[PDB]
Design a protein around this ligand. Structure first.
Ligand SMILES: CN(C(=O)Oc1ccc(Cl)cc1)[C@H]1CC[C@H](c2ccc(CN3CCCCC3)cc2)CC1
Ligand SMILES: CN(C(=O)Oc1ccc(Cl)cc1)[C@H]1CC[C@H](c2ccc(CN3CCCCC3)cc2)CC1
Ligand SMILES: CCCCCCCCOCCOCCOCCOCCO
Ligand SMILES: CCCCCCCCOCCOCCOCCOCCO
Lengths: 619, 619
């Protein structure tokens, strides 16, 4: 029955595989990427009329009937996303009259205008001189003097936030302004009677920081700031040291952009680092068939390649299938062998991790490393010396990254400081990188493939972590994926692999939870709203990926031969396309709970295949 | 008479002009460049068999009958140059038996072997493990902690030495060894009974430094060196900040190569600065028509373009000649506008200088800047706003560069510290950058073109400098050119332009000196030996350039209508080629008096033209 679905899914995946032997699906987010790119160009005085055009199509293409933009497809209108998109358009050419601009402006007004937008959105407008710098949370270059074991030192922030802060310190130090031509001035973002509803700090504003912030805005006005020069060079240096091979910074949109501006501020437009970081942007761009152009918040080669392999294996292809070897070989060349920031906590840990993108050595993540090593562990490559060695280095690294609570973070160890969550500046998304259930789960499943069971201390400490973190209804939160189905599926699948007993009470209590949220159409769905409102916990339109997850959770718990189980499999079979692929008009990926969502293109093809491969195994 | 010769010369230059509108002749030196390149590749594990071949033909081709290599054509055999060339060859494939190897080795031995070579030559061999690191002058990373106003702080060394030291500190800190395959081991460089005659420090070795060095090799052996890590990073950052646009460092062979090695040592072969720094080398390479390949100690676009224009103007072409405009425009885009190291002494001086090579913003030199501004001053470009503006920036910069003695240096101001000239490490060439007569002369000639005479204090202070520096026989030393003819010609030409009286006693005493060294053939010659032995002061085979110089000195002193004067003109007219050019099998350029000589390709064509253009003016 499903076999024909599998065969068709396989030849499809294999078709999508690039020549070098890796897979790479585009990553989706929201328009703040493109909108900020437009402004960045303006700042660096490098505007290409042709690019602006493609960008304008995209922006509009993404606008909804009501004239706004959301964080995910079918999501509620977002203020910040729309404010930025609005400014971006008005700069490209759009007159504040045209219908689209009308609808957007009205929504922006009905919300309290520019005065209600996140800190970033206001800062960008500050850079172009449309908002007072005095009303922007201050982040001094001097932050660079905090030691390794001090409150608020850069290494207390998560990798993604860290680089940004360092970069912005330099920017806010000078508080530069790059005026927009009169034609694009956006005063109408203030015209509003609605009371401005400002978003506070992620964890709550402590009067201390509030005070301090004002203290910094005052000091910022003095005539002399002793050692600031040194503070700035400290920041600049930190940046020149960690620039990524592709010319980016961390392989993410945020710090990259800011870092460039910081150099432009320091008259280094014709320094190697600046030039590289600039022409490096193109790689992250994407030409849309309808004339539009988009920029990616990040790229996922390693990731896609990793899952791609695992899926095709559980599917049926030989552990030495010449096509999967191209992947195996490729992955091996990716392994990082040099100390990154993670080393500040583990100076004696030997490098061996992997990263999300192509060439980003200073920021390998636990999630990727696990999937990659586990994937290789299933292949039989030509040089067994390399495969054997690679797996070892990586394995030993993942073990040395385990945090205090037995769980695994994503980039650093025990990055659980709760201090940064109160700073005025931090009011958007996560700022720290503590251990999560999904990452941990993935790690355990990686060990499980090797054999290491519950007998091993490392594993027990982790399993204990998961047990304590399980939700009342028996589900598991989803951090880097949407959401409880993603998490519940991850854990159960893992626990099953590390040897734990699938008959346990807490286990069963989870499987029942899965069968319970199965939609009528036989599949499973969970809307992104599940991060905001608990009513959407496991509820939502059925998607190929989210189904496959809730399905792996069942196959793992032994209930592979069940009603709900066979039911779901049917969904994947019927919803499949003639070419063998699958469609998924929703986001199943998470950046920051409730603040940033991602659309992983491959998920729709890879996961359904992996699930069907595991279902075929259960018989 | 001479007109045809001039016309013939002109059309030639104009034919050599690149499309972009600039001129660029290759720069010649000795084989230590290519030989060190070979080793560099080995270290970075990037050897291209095909290249090695082209480098071999080159090396052999440059070897003389006696089986040695000198610092200049027709020069005495050099030990260092030959030792390095020898090792380079043996590594490429040459067996110690073959004739070339025999003759070369013999010479090496008759001199005391490896133990007599300069500090560098021994260090390179140390890097490949053929010489003990303990016997190499130590330069600690800690040198990075010396303040701006302290003994031996990096800013006390001249620009070219400075960058190198910073780079090498990192290298010597680790004292790495990259073993040569048994096949190329060079123990035979020790086999010698001749007593090793070592070269001491440039200015004399004070037992203080001698002992100190020992202390360093001692401290180098301890188990802990507090703050060294920080000293290294201090030096690494310094390098990252000053990497040149073209991925080089200073636009010179030395620091560039070492910088790369220092990055390789720090496992940064993946970092952008290294990548760009590596692939940037090709630009300095040169394919020889006989199958060989050479590397340039540096490149001279700006310079060549600068003189090229001035020559073609004094010759006769219109100040707005569309072809010279291409040059004018080009030069304008070159002007540096950002603070370099020179700014450490003149924080309030506005950027406006130019550099020797294509893109090297942190190191503009007085010489270039003067020639360029002066050259622009003689043109009529479409945008008189920029031409006027540029000249001003450049002018003001030059002035703000004048040192205490009224004389101008090349890169920094009052870089006359005599401390560095005693360090054990510094035993090759110049290490400081004090004011010279030639640079100063060139500067005065630039101001003269505008109109500023002897009334202006700036000028007078400079002229006083020259007067005090004149030699007993009435000649002027040549620093960046060979030699007294180069200098004497520069000064007199300048003095004439600033308004000074050409009838003065000290002036005439110079012109007579010129006429007294006019070779029988009607031309002028001055061998590079004139730096070593005073017998060759103005003595040597006649060359097109050196003649033109001694000829401009006469035309300036009013003696344009003289016997010696017309005599010389004849030489240039006869020795001229059918194509209009000129040949010059000798070096008329200087890097370091008595240690490094350069062959400026263009000189033979440009200067003879400029002189004939000025001779045509005298009538
Ligand atoms: C828009 N973003 C952002 O981080 O904004 C901020 C910047 C600075 C600060 Cl202080 C706070 C937020 C995004 C930056 C990229 C980030 C991102 C992080 C990780 C990954 C890949 N990751 C690792 C491999 C497995 C799981 C997925 C992909 C994207 C997701 C958030
Ligand atoms: C081989 N070299 C060297 O500098 O070695 C040392 C390195 C470190 C130390 Cl401590 C001592 C010597 C050379 C490095 C390049 C140097 C050089 C300097 C200036 C120029 C251009 N110059 C400026 C424009 C007009 C006059 C010519 C061209 C080349 C000539 C010497
Ligand atoms: C120049 C000294 C090199 C020794 C440093 C290795 C120690 C590991 O770094 C500790 C962690 O700090 C994070 C930085 O790693 C990024 C790049 O560092 C650049 C070259 O060392
Ligand atoms: C990095 C601090 C910004 C200072 C630049 C403003 C220029 C003021 O002159 C200060 C003198 O600094 C001398 C160094 O030249 C080095 C260039 O490295 C580039 C980064 O500024």
């Amino acid at each position: 029955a499903y076999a024909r679905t599998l065969d068709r899914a396989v030849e499809y995946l294999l078709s999508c595989q690039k020549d070098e032997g890796y897979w790479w699906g585009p990553l989706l987010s929201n328009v703040t990427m493109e909108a900020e790119y437009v402004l960045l160009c303006h700042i660096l005085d490098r505007v290409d009329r042709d690019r602006m055009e493609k960008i304008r199509r995209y922006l509009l293409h993404e606008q909804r009937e009501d004239g706004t933009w959301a964080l995910y497809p079918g999501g509620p209108p977002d203020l910040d996303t729309t404010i930025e998109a609005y400014v971006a358009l008005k700069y490209i050419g759009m007159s504040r009259d045209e219908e689209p601009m009308q609808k957007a402006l009205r929504f922006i007004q009905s919300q309290g205008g520019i005065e209600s937008s996140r800190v970033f959105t206001r800062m960008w407008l500050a850079l172009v001189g449309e908002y007072p710098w005095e009303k922007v949370p201050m982040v001094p270059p001097e932050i660079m003097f905090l030691g390794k074991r001090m409150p608020l030192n850069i290494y207390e922030f998560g990798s993604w936030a860290r680089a940004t802060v360092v970069a912005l310190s330099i920017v806010m130090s000078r508080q530069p302004v790059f005026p927009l031509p009169e034609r694009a001035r956006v005063p109408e973002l203030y015209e509003t009677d609605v009371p401005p509803r400002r978003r506070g700090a992620k964890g709550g504003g402590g009067w201390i920081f509030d005070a301090l912030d004002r203290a910094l805005h005052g000091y910022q006005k003095l005539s002399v700031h002793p050692f600031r020069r040194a503070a700035e060079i400290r920041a600049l240096d930190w940046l020149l040291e960690r620039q990524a091979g592709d010319g980016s910074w961390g392989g993410i949109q945020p710090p990259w952009f800011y870092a460039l501006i910081a150099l432009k501020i320091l008259d280094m437009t014709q320094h190697p680092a600046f030039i590289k970081g600039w022409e490096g942007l193109e790689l992250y761009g994407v030409e849309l068939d309808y004339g539009g152009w988009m920029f990616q918040a990040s790229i996922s080669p390693v990731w896609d390649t990793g899952l791609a392999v695992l899926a095709l294996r559980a599917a049926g292809l030989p552990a030495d299938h010449d096509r999967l070897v191209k992947a195996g070989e490729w992955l091996l060349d990716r392994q990082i062998t040099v100390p990154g920031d993670w080393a500040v906590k583990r100076p004696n840990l030997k490098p061996g991790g992997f990263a999300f993108q192509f060439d980003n050595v200073y920021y390998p993540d636990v999630d990727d490393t696990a999937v990659v090593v586990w994937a290789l562990n299933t292949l039989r490559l030509p040089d067994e010396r390399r495969r054997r060695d690679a797996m070892t280095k990586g394995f030993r690294w993942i073990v040395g990254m385990q945090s205090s609570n037995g769980g695994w973070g994503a980039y650093d160890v025990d990055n659980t400081s709760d201090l940064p969550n109160h700073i005025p500046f931090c009011d958007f998304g996560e700022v720290t990188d503590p251990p999560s259930e999904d990452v941990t789960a993935h790690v355990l499943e990686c060990f499980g493939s090797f054999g290491y069971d519950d007998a091993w201390k490392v594993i027990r400490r982790a399993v204990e972590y998961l047990k304590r973190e399980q939700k009342p209804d028996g589900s598991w939160f989803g951090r880097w994926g949407v959401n409880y189905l993603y998490g519940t599926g991850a854990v159960v699948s893992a626990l099953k692999a590390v040897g734990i007993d699938t008959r346990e009470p807490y286990i069963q209590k989870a499987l029942d939870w899965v069968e319970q949220h199965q939609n009528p159409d036989g599949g499973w769905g969970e809307d992104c709203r599940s991060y905001e409102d608990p009513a959407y916990a496991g509820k939502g339109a059925s998607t190929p990926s989210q189904t496959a997850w809730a399905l792996m959770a069942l196959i793992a718990g032994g209930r592979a031969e069940s009603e709900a189980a066979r039911r779901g499999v049917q969904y994947l079979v019927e919803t499949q396309r003639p070419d063998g692929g699958w469609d998924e008009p929703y986001y199943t990926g998470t950046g920051f709970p409730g603040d940033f969502y991602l659309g992983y293109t491959m998920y729709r093809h890879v996961f359904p295949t992996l699930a069907l491969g595991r279902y075929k195994q259960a018989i």
